[PDB]
Amino acid sequence: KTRSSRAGLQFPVGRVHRLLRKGNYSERVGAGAPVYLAAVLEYLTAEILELAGNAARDNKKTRIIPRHLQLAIRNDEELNKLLGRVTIAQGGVLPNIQAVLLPK
Amino acid sequence: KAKTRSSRAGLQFPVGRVHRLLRKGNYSERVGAGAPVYLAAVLEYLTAEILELAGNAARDNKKTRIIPRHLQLAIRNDEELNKLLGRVTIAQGGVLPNIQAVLLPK
Amino acid sequence: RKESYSIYVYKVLKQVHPDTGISSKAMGIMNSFVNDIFERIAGEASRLAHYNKRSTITSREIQTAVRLLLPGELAKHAVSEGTKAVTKYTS
Amino acid sequence: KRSRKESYSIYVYKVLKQVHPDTGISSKAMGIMNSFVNDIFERIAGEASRLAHYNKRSTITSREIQTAVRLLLPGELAKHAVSEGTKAVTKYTSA
Amino acid sequence: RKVLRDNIQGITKPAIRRLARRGGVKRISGLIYEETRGVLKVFLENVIRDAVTYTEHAKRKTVTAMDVVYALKRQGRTLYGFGG
Amino acid sequence: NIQGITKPAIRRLARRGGVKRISGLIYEETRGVLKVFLENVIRDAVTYTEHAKRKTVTAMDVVYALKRQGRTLYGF
Amino acid sequence: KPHRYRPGTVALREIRRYQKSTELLIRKLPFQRLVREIAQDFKTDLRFQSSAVMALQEACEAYLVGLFEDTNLCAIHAKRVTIMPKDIQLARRIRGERA
Amino acid sequence: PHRYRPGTVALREIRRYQKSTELLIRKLPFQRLVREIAQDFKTDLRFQSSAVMALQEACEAYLVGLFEDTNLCAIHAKRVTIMPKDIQLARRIRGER
DNA sequence: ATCAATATCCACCTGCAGATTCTACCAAAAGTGTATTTGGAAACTGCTCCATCAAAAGGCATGTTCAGCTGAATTCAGCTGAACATGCCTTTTGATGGAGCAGTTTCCAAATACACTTTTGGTAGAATCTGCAGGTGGATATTGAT
DNA sequence: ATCAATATCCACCTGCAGATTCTACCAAAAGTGTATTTGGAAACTGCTCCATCAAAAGGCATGTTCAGCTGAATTCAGCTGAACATGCCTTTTGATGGAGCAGTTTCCAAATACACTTTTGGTAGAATCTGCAGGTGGATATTGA
Ligand SMILES: [Mn+2]
């Protein structure tokens, strides 16, 4: 009967709703907000996990580490935009070398 | 009789407004009584700082009325105020004159 | 005490990649991401409310905020899921 | 059907006379002033909320404002800020 | 009314010139003009998009100055003098 | 102490950065900017701790301070 | 003579001139059309407040003036006095607008 | 004997490091640096072992980044050797100064 | 462009321990049932403000000429910074132990929140002012040709 | 080494559009009487955090050689600035119609407020497990001949 199952989401809607109340974001929190936010947070996670998987899978590892995540985030143009100001610990940088630096 | 709370602290800025705006702002659940004054005082001060430097700019330019240009100059000439308002742009502010060294004749 | 989204991220991870698993550190990175977005979406949402002299945040406020915070396809898909989960929850 | 919106205009002006009696400010400049006041107002209160929230406090003390000011204001400006506030508060409580 | 199109060329060369002068630039390459326009067009889009989004949330058919201001703030390009 | 930041280390940092040739002057210079980074981050960091009243700088204090500086950090 | 000013001399004169004044360099009517065109594409039949269009024009001009200074420093840095798209593009890259 | 031409190892270094994520700066010296800086602000402070990492992670991440920008400025001036001159520009453009 | 002789990477291989993930259960929340407040959607409709259009006009944007001087190309070489073999010591790391100290309770006196009622302090028109914007002119440079 | 040639500067001028004042209502602080919390304030832990203390081993500091990178100096093709001539269209001014904010009212659909009853998600052990980490053996990438 969890409100989350009703919306069919893995993320805790209750948690989000309780978090919204204690946040001071507003006077009153609509019932639809919690599921919506919670929902939106789920998808985003989904999106990044999937790409890391690939990174992980691509690297030959069955376990995701920060590097996989950074690779995934930075290779994707849109995800980069969203987390441009953020920095992942142990993320390293994508491997890029200027053309001119290469031997001619 | 009746006394304004600001007068109690001897400020020009409206402590009642600052307190009420803090309440309605959802910044916190409880707003102490000291905070509104403390804050109200901080802005008053900052306002006087900015007004001070502009004034001179107006006098420097032989104007008895402060216009934006003076504010921009005030804010950009002072190192610290500049910093505080680094990301901001003043409408009609213009820019501090500055020609690059290399660009000049010789 | 000391609650984290760690448990939830794992489930989501399993759907997309049953075969894969996530390190402790990477998990933390994921928790941080969730939190930031959460704070970022909620913040804006709050502002939409205030700018409009509203005293309550509708799911709509969460959505409009999502259109400003997320770009292109990320936004589209993001907006859809929200409306979809809401339409289903209400039913 | 009046629709009265308030501004810090009256207050900025009083302060303008304090620093320079002879000087005056224009409409366009006033607007700029109100914005400055409002901007700074939001920074301190918003940044003050964070302090309170980070420490699981349910109330914003005059103290939290101060700590926010230190973070928000740079150098001497910050120092003077704190001074003027504390003065105001100490004076207020003592009355 | 009248159909609007290719108004981005409204931003003349002298005007782009003038903007550069105030910027302190003494010499300007010819390719600059068209490039500038490009950047300007992008700036506007991004700021107007948000602006109008704030308008759409309000349901108003008019974009007030505020809309523009709130917009600019999000963009980290805060503006003083119009609505707050 | 700032000299703890050895020249070869700085050279390494630059590599990951994509640099191939480093002037000999950079080092002191790379050292200087670094010193500044911490000064600004820690300062705001401590202020947060002091408001807290703790005598220990949590990993958290740093995070909050980094966000204020705009240099957001994940994983701690 | 005809009296003529050596090249670059006037540019220096313009620089001193426009930096002192605060008026908007771009022509008001054309900007407005541009702003109304772009906005029309996002939402049809929108209406703009006289003050809203100004706001937009102030921020734009400000942005560009600002971009030009940085660009100028990139030009001076590359040993050239002439700004170039190569400069603008770099400047924005460093700014992070589009790395 | 065999000697690697100049700049060959450099590129070997670049390729190598970008591949690994480990922090390059020596941990103890850094922590020593941090404590020193922290003391000017407050005395007898204590740091969570984790608190230092955050600090170190941030600095190396920032420093690595600064160099990327530094390079573009050095490349942009027709050079291939980063100079203090380049660093300042990148920072001046960034708004740090 | 090979030939050849270094030094490097680079898969294929393969062993246990530092992590991961799975278990086994208890306070903290979340979900429910009821009972109330109330926020703001719908329904007018006053009425600014925005869109438009007509007109005259000169501020300026365009195009074209010309040729000054900057950007780009070359060439050279002095010397800065990579590559390295070298010799040595500060960083690692690993417990070990003690304690400064985050983090919990548990009351509670001081400080806030509420709920109503007065009481001014502001804000939005008017009535009155007055810097200063927009011109004019000489004095004062600053430039660029000789 | 000169000097017209032109633009830039500064003070004087003067009505008028943009202040400064001047006033009446009334929205919202201020004053009071209670009804709740709140964050400290002593006591006390269980811990993370300093301190040594102790070996070794990478990792850092150095003095060497010289390869090729950055700067300086020389050139000159032609890109871009300065001037005019032309006449297009952005400005100014003002008039109107009416789309569409916004202030009011009206009141249900929705959110908030407890009192409990349940279920879940964080912890601390308990039972697996992916990689770190070396370790060959073999093209690969460099560089000199
Ligand atoms: Mn169109």
Author numbering:
A (entry chain G): 15 to 118
B (entry chain C): 13 to 118
C (entry chain H): 33 to 123
D (entry chain D): 30 to 124
E (entry chain F): 19 to 102
F (entry chain B): 25 to 100
G (entry chain E): 37 to 135
H (entry chain A): 38 to 134
Quote the study on this structure.
The basic unit of chromatin is the nucleosome core particle, which contains 145–147 base pairs of DNA. The DNA binds on the surface of the histone octamer, composed of two copies of the four core histones, H2A, H2B, H3, and H4. On the other hand, the N-terminal tails of the four core histones and the C-terminal tail of histone H2A protrude from the nucleosome core particle. In the present study, we determined the crystal structures of four nucleosomes lacking the N-terminal tail of one of the histones, H2A, H2B, H3, and H4.
We compared the structure and electron density maps of the tlH3 nucleosome with those of the wt nucleosome. We found that the electron density map of the H3 K37–R42 region of the tlH3 nucleosome, which is a binding site for DNA, was very ambiguous as compared to that of the wt nucleosome (Fig. 4A and (B)). The H3 H39–R42 region directly binds to a minor groove of the two DNA gyres in the wt nucleosome: the side chain of the H3 H39 residue is inserted in the minor groove of the entry gyre, and the H3 R40 and R42 side-chains form hydrogen bonds with the atoms of the sugar ring, the adenine base, and the phosphate backbone of another DNA gyre. In the tlH3 nucleosome, the hydrogen bonds between the DNA and the H3 R40 and R42 residues could be disrupted or weakened. Alternatively, the H3 K37–R42 binding to DNA may be stably retained but more variable in the tlH3 nucleosome, thus producing the ambiguous electron densities. However, previous analyses, such as single molecule transcription experiments, molecular dynamics simulations, and FRET measurements, indicated that the deletion of the H3 N-terminal tail enhances the transient unwrapping of DNA at the entry/exit regions. Therefore, we prefer the conclusion that some histone–DNA contacts are disrupted in the tlH3 nucleosome, thus reducing its stability. In the present study, we found that the H39–R42 region of histone H3 becomes “less stable” and/or “poorly organized” upon the deletion of the H3 N-terminal amino acid residues 1–27. By contrast, in nucleosomes containing tlH2B (lacking residues 1–24) and tlH3 (lacking residues 1–27), the initial phase of disruption clearly occurred at lower temperatures, as compared to the wt nucleosome.
